[PDB]
């Protein structure tokens, strides 16, 4: 039936979603920021995995269909995200097939984050800002770490960009970089390999 | 016998002091003697019924029941009769004044005159028989007074409702009568000779008139008075003693105040013109000039003098440098005069003047940083210009306001003090755009998210040009006739409209309103070059001071969008982020601070950090609306700390003052996770920060006394009830600073008891009686919450919230003296709570579809006992103060102590032997409730257990409390059935110790399946050390605790019963 | 005669304007007619 193909694709989807640790008392802002991000990601992964197991069991198994499970069944038949899963910023309501891939990418990023946090050491990592739920929280935590380590003033901190913080996952829009000098080209977008951010007062 | 005789002596004292009481009859203009002195009678009857209620309980009331009960119901019928009597007299006074003073009513309504004469004859017979016998008992002694008074009230209400068509006729006489409701205009027309009744109503008419300065003869109006005590003296006083009508001398007052304000504006600008020619100025003459004039004229004269100085400098760099030097010198003079303690009216005058002077400093620096050589350069033309022509013969047209290809007059409406806004570059862009919309004869329309300064920039532009402004908050019940009525009111008055939240107005109705808007714009285009326009198919006069402004938010709560034909009539303007740095710097410069700029530079990035670093919540606000209240509280606590130091100049720890205000304002919104993040933010932003709190020992001990009175467990801060008392202190601080309050948090955190205990503690401390109105908004419709406009006959009924606020405003029972707390006990959603976004605003007033604006007195606080604030938008979340009650604030041992305290006292069938049964039951259930024991671990385990419904603590806790109350009643009837042998204490122990286990099983597992309650039964069997029915197969649910303290099987209870052949399948 | 559809008075204004336009002959314009299809039915039928 339609539920047989639904169960086949329902076992197809969660094969990239396995688990995430939970790892909350540290002075540095990066540590608590990564701790709450890993907690949010593990909570969302647990909710998504439990809902997928529940809809698998109500498809082919001894589980009856509730109101929430019926809403989940209809929403995943139509392919649109249910409103329970879409907690973070999804651009203009994308389909579920790209969304579970983005979810797996974020979960893998948080898994590497927790692996690095299992052992400063947290400054040595490289981050793609698209895989975080709140990127400006990471930027303000970086600024707070700089102001904490160097005892500087938060009001006049500026940004110096090179191509001591490593940022990956950056994509331009119709421009190219050559020794930190922008040039114009007919290409739609290029990917910046690694971007070094350093906070300077002047 | 001596105690009973003392109670009878107090009863005789009640008899004597009520025999001495009487009705105070005072002659009213040689017509009849009417009774006065009403709040004295109200508190007399209240304290007497309180005395009878206090002597009811204990200890020798039983011998003297009858006389005290007779005095109780005597006071009850006296209270009822006089409560209807005060309303009857109050209605009759203005109805008699209207039916005597107004003419051609008998020609108009003859049946109304005949009835009113019949009820006036009956009423004057009632005055004759009270004036014969002015005793209260004698006036009560006439039979059938209650039926006669109810019929008189019915006849007064009839005559009022059948007269109401005529009032609209009077609304065509005076324009401002359009802004008045039916009862208030009834009082206004009725008491035109009494005059002193009308002074409560002048706040709704004019912007800055609160009461009229009246002669002792009550026939010459000497001037007008604001709500802050500032008064304008009339140069030529209007003679009421010539006997004009009410609208005639009202229009004379309106014209006289404009002529007078223009005259003192001319004198004040002469004073600043002779003052500003000196490069060095004397501060004593400056402060006497400041104390001489009003704030509006002083700021206006400063603007005129600065504009003329810059223009004569630009006639021609060095004169502009001289103007900048004089501006900086006056700024230093204002800073030196504002850094010391001053009276508050001249303090606000100094704050307005220092804001305007630093705005002119910024503008003068903006011209002087570039090369400007002529006054026709656009850079000077891009800012506001003021022109005073002294040779002009008409002082109403003497002042011109010139902005970029736009010229305006001055309406000269009195404003009072009000709030002076900050001229940010965004505010300069808004001013330029909106006056360019006004120059093309187009209405204005700002849009953006809430918390940007949209309607307040419009209102300060209205007060900047001196035009009378009005603010309406339109909801979906705004009709065609209501909008046309307020539009013709704005037409005849000549006032600016500031229609807020237009987007929720029912798209067809928006399109219908667009035609009247087009008619108004066509009339203004005709005026722009005997000019009328058609509203409601009626041609009416349009004043040149017309302007309409549309404050809306795009998709805040899914509100409707504007049609395209109406979008052309209103120019659009977007403000999404105002400059927080400059407004913070100027507010800290204006309150009086040494390191004001560093405080702004350390608090605006601090708000930027705290907007992102804390977790996303439904009730989090870190916008400019919170920043302004934070700065206001910082100024208030800076004045408080300076006065505390000077109770026993010099510098003060301003950093600690700002941090303390930030903590006191922004702690109770946060959940338990976000407190150390804010603490680390305050440590990283401010190095020498520190903290301080508490110091409310009298309030804390009164909270302790009233907590132990009403069976609550007070805490000392770190005890079992410490966090709840701390949150009640936070609620007290927010009610001290804020206006309306969210009490957010999960259900079962004691928020109801929190506001009740705070109200009773404040009543016990300050002596002001606190009355609370609890309203569930979702239990009734929205049209019943606020009121209905009847579509056939345009009458405005009263909703529940409208009736409560109107009863507060009327203050017939002296309700303004008491504290009024209106709590909404529902869930906040933008269907109805978006009608209060002007009440919770700084505009402080309630709008109605009838045009009847109800201002709110500051005694009333509006709170919300609510669950979660997800459904509300930021028009309500950002516009209130949030107190967060987490689920672990009310701990479970607190509820156990409450149950044991309610078990020991307050006997169940409300000393008694069953009260002793309750006490012994409390001592034998005491080792089970406290710490982990039995109840806490089982309740923790039951949360892991799944249920059919959602299981929290309080439902099954109340279930268990009803279980143990029935156990106490069961012991009571067993002692009733066994009089020879009472309830033995070892039997009671071994009975209750099993009844509690059976009860907690049916409480934490009575709402699920058989397997799951069997699981909780075997959990109870495995964990606790109680005697148990020894059968590993049969669960404990299948047993019943007996009266002998043992267990009987439920399967042994059911018999093998057969039923008759006749009744086989009867229901 | 530019009459915006969306109120009862707008409906009566549109009806009297369309009868006057039938008898006299001048144009009649109705603004935003899609806010009331239940009156658009009788408008179309009366026009036919
Ligand atoms: N500090 C306290 N001391 C003793 N008992 C308390 C305390 N706080 C709450 N309680 C008890 O908790 C129970 C429920 O509390 P309350 O009725 O105040 O709930 P609430 O939080 O206002 O509920 P809701 O928000 O769902 O309307 C009552 O039995 C009350 O006596
Ligand atoms: N330049 C300024 N000076 C002083 N206060 C300002 C300024 N700009 C904005 N505000 C304050 O910001 C708040 C914004 O209110 P707003 O959100 O526009 O009301 P509404 O909810 O009707 O949209 C106002 O209370 C106003 O006092
Ligand atoms: Mg507003
Ligand atoms: Mg409650």
Curated annotation (Swiss-Prot), chain C:
Protein location: Cytoplasm, Cytoskeleton
Top-rank taxon: Eukaryota
Medical condition linked: Charcot-Marie-Tooth disease, axonal, type 2O: An axonal form of Charcot-Marie-Tooth disease, a disorder of the peripheral nervous system, characterized by progressive weakness and atrophy, initially of the peroneal muscles and later of the distal muscles of the arms. Charcot-Marie-Tooth disease is classified in two main groups on the basis of electrophysiologic properties and histopathology: primary peripheral demyelinating neuropathies (designated CMT1 when they are dominantly inherited) and primary peripheral axonal neuropathies (CMT2). Cortical dysplasia, complex, with other brain malformations 13: An autosomal dominant disorder characterized by global developmental delay with impaired intellectual development. Some patients show signs of peripheral neuropathy, such as abnormal gait and hyporeflexia. CDCBM13 is associated with variable neuronal migration defects resulting in cortical malformations.
Protein family (similarity comment): Belongs to the dynein heavy chain family.
Subunit record text: Homodimer. The cytoplasmic dynein 1 complex consists of two catalytic heavy chains (HCs) and a number of non-catalytic subunits presented by intermediate chains (ICs), light intermediate chains (LICs) and light chains (LCs); the composition seems to vary in respect to the IC, LIC and LC composition. The heavy chain homodimer serves as a scaffold for the probable homodimeric assembly of the respective non-catalytic subunits. The ICs and LICs bind directly to the HC dimer and dynein LCs assemble on the IC dimer. Interacts with DYNC1LI1; DYNC1LI1 and DYNC1LI2 bind mutually exclusive to DYNC1H1.
Recorded domain comment: Dynein heavy chains probably consist of an N-terminal stem (which binds cargo and interacts with other dynein components), and the head or motor domain. The motor contains six tandemly-linked AAA domains in the head, which form a ring. A stalk-like structure (formed by two of the coiled coil domains) protrudes between AAA 4 and AAA 5 and terminates in a microtubule-binding site. A seventh domain may also contribute to this ring; it is not clear whether the N-terminus or the C-terminus forms this extra domain.
Protein function: Cytoplasmic dynein 1 acts as a motor for the intracellular retrograde motility of vesicles and organelles along microtubules. Dynein has ATPase activity; the force-producing power stroke is thought to occur on release of ADP. Plays a role in mitotic spindle assembly and metaphase plate congression.
Protein's UniProt name: Cytoplasmic dynein 1 heavy chain 1
Organism this protein belongs to: Homo sapiens (Human)
């Amino acid at each position: 039936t339609l539920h047989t193909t639904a169960s086949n694709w329902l076992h197809l989807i969660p094969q990239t979603l396995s688990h995430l640790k939970r790892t909350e008392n540290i002075k540095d802002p990066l540590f608590r920021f990564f701790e709450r991000e890993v907690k949010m990601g593990a909570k969302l992964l647990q909710d998504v995995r439990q809902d997928l197991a529940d809809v698998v069991q109500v498809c082919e198994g001894k589980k009856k269909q509730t109101n929430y499970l019926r809403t989940l069944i209809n929403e995943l038949v139509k392919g649109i995200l249910p409103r329970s899963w879409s907690h973070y910023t999804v651009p203009a309501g994308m389909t579920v097939i790209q969304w579970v891939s983005d979810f797996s990418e974020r979960i893998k990023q948080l898994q590497n984050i927790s692996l690095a946090a299992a052992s400063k050491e947290l400054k040595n990592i490289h981050v793609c800002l698209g895989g975080l739920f709140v990127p400006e929280a990471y930027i303000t935590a970086t600024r707070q770490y700089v102001a904490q380590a160097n005892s500087w003033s938060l009001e006049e901190l500026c940004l110096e960009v090179n191509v001591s913080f490593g940022v990956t996952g950056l994509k331009l829009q119709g421009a190219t970089c050559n020794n930190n000098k922008l040039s114009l080209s007919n290409a739609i977008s290029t990917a910046l390999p690694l971007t070094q951010l350093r906070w300077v007062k002047q | 016998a001596q105690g009973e005789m003392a109670l009878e002596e107090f009863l005789k004292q009640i008899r004597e002091v009520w025999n001495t009481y009487e009705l105070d009859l005072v002659n009213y203009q040689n017509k009849c003697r009417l009774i006065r002195g009403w709040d004295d009678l109200f508190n007399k009857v209240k304290e007497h019924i309180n005395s009878v209620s206090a002597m009811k309980l204990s200890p020798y009331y039983k011998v003297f029941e009858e006389d005290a009960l007779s005095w109780e119901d005597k006071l009850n019928r006296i209270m009822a009769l006089f409560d209807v009597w005060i309303d009857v007299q109050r209605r009759w006074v203005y109805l008699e004044g209207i039916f005597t003073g107004s003419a051609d009513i008998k020609h108009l309504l003859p049946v109304e005159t005949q009835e009113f004469q019949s009820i006036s004859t009956e009423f004057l017979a009632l005055m004759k028989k009270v004036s014969k016998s002015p005793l209260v008992m004698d006036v009560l002694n006439i039979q059938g007074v209650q039926r006669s008074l109810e019929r008189l009230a019915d006849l007064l209400g009839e005559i009022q409702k059948a007269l109401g068509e005529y009032l609209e006729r009077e609304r065509s006489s005076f324009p401002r009568f359009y802004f008045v409701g039916d009862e208030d205009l009834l009082e206004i027309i009725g008491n035109s000779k009494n005059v002193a009744k009308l002074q409560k109503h002048f706040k709704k008419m004019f912007a800055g008139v609160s009461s009229i300065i009246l002669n002792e003869d009550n026939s010459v109006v000497l001037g007008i008075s604001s709500r802050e005590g500032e008064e304008v003296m009339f140069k030529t006083p209007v003679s009421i003693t010539e006997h004009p009508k009410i609208n005639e001398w009202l229009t004379l007052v309106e014209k006289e105040m404009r002529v007078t304000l223009a005259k003192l504006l001319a004198e004040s600008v002469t004073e600043v013109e002779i003052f500003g020619k000196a490069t060095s100025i004397d501060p004593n003459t400056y402060i006497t000039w400041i104390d001489k004039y009003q704030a509006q004229l002083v700021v206006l004269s400063a603007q005129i003098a600065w504009s003329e100085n810059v223009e004569t400098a630009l006639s021609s760099a060095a004169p502009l440098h001289s103007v900048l030097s004089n501006v900086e010198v006056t700024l230093n003079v204002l800073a030196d005069s504002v850094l010391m303690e001053q009276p508050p009216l001249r303090r606000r005058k100094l704050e307005h003047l220092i804001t305007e002077l630093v705005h002119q400093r910024d503008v003068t620096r903006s011209l002087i940083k570039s090369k400007i050589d002529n006054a026709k350069s656009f850079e000077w033309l891009s800012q506001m210009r003021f022109y005073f022509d002294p040779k002009q013969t008409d002082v109403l047209q003497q002042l011109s306001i010139q902005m970029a290809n736009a010229k305006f007059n001055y309406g000269f409406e009195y404003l009072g003090v009000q709030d002076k806004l900050v001229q940010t570059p965004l505010t300069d862009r808004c001013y330029l755009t909106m006056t360019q919309a006004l120059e093309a004869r187009l209405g204005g329309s700002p849009f953006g998210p809430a918390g940007t300064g949209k309607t307040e920039s419009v209102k300060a532009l209205g007060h900047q040009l001196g035009r009378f402004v009005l603010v309406f908050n339109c909801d979906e019940t705004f009709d065609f006739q209501a909008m046309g009525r307020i539009f013709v009111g704005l037409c005849q008055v000549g006032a600016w409209g500031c229609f807020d939240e237009f987007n929720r107005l029912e798209e067809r109705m928006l399109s219908a309103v667009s035609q009247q808007v087009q008619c108004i714009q066509e009339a203004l285009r005709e005026h722009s070059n005997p000019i009328t326009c058609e509203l409601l198919n009626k041609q009416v006069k349009v004043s040149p001071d017309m302007a309409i402004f549309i404050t809306m938010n795009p998709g805040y709560a899914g509100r409707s969008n504007l049609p395209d034909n109406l979008k052309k009539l209103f120019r659009s303007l977007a403000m999404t982020k105002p400059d927080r740095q400059l407004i913070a710097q100027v507010m800290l410069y204006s309150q009086g601070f040494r390191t004001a700029e560093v405080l702004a530079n350390k608090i605006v990035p601090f708000f930027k950090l705290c907007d992102e670093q804390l977790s996303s919540q439904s009730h989090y606000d870190f916008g400019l609306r919170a920043l302004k209240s934070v700065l206001v509280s910082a100024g208030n606590v800076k004045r408080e700390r300076i006065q505390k130091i000077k109770r026993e100049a010099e510098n003060l720890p301003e950093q600690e003052i700002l941090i303390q205000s930030v903590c006191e304002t922004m702690v109770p919104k946060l959940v338990a996770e976000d407190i150390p993040l804010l603490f680390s933010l305050l440590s990283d932003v401010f190095p020498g920060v520190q903290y301080h709190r508490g110091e409310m020992t009298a309030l804390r001990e009164e909270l302790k006394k009233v907590c132990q009175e009403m069976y609550l467990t007070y805490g000392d801060g770190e005890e079992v009830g410490g966090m709840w008392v701390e949150k009640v202190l936070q609620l007290y601080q927010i009610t001290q600073i804020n206006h309306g309050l969210m009490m957010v948090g999960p259900s079962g955190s004691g928020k109801s008891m929190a506001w009740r205990v705070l109200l009773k503690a404040l009543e016990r401390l300050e002596g002001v009686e606190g009355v609370a109105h609890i309203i569930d908004p979702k239990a009734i419709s929205k049209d019943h919450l606020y009121g209905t406009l009847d579509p056939n006959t345009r009458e405005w009924t009263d909703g529940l919230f409208t009736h409560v606020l109107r009863k507060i405003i009327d203050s017939v029972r002296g309700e303004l003296q008491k504290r009024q707390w209106i709590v909404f006990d529902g869930d906040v959603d933008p269907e109805w709570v978006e009608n209060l976004n002007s009440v919770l605003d700084d505009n402080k007033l309630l709008t109605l579809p009838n045009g009847e604006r109800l201002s709110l007195p500051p005694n009333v606080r509006i709170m919300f006992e609510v669950q979660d604030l997800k459904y509300a938008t930021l028009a309500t979340v950002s516009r209130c103060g949030m107190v967060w009650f987490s689920e672990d604030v009310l701990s479970t041992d607190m509820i156990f102590n409450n149950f044991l305290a309610r078990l020991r006292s307050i006997p169940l069938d409300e000393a008694s032997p069953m009260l002793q049964i309750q006490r012994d039951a409390a001592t034998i259930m005491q080792p089970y409730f406290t710490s982990n024991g039995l109840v806490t671990k089982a309740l923790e385990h039951a949360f892991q257990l799944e249920h059919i419904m959602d299981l929290t603590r309080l439902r099954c806790l109340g279930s268990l409390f009803s279980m143990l109350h029935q156990a106490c009643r069961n012991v009571a009837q067993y002692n009733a059935n066994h009089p020879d042998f009472p309830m033995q204490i070892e039997q009671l122990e071994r009975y209750i110790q099993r009844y509690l286990v059976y009860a907690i099983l049916w409480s934490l597992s009575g709402d699920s399946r058989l397997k799951m309650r069997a699981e909780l039964g075997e959990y109870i069997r495995r964990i606790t050390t109680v005697p148990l029915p020894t059968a590993p197969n049969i669960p404990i649910i299948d047993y019943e605790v007996s009266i002998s303290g043992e267990w009987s099987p439920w399967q042994a209870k059911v018999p093998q019963i057969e039923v008759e052949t006749h009744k086989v399948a009867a229901p | 005669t530019s009459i915006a559809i969306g109120s009862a008075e707008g409906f009566n204004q549109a009806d009297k304007a369309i009868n006057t336009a039938v008898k006299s002959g001048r144009w009649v314009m109705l603004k935003n007619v899609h806010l009331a299809p239940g009156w658009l039915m009788q408008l179309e039928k009366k026009l036919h």
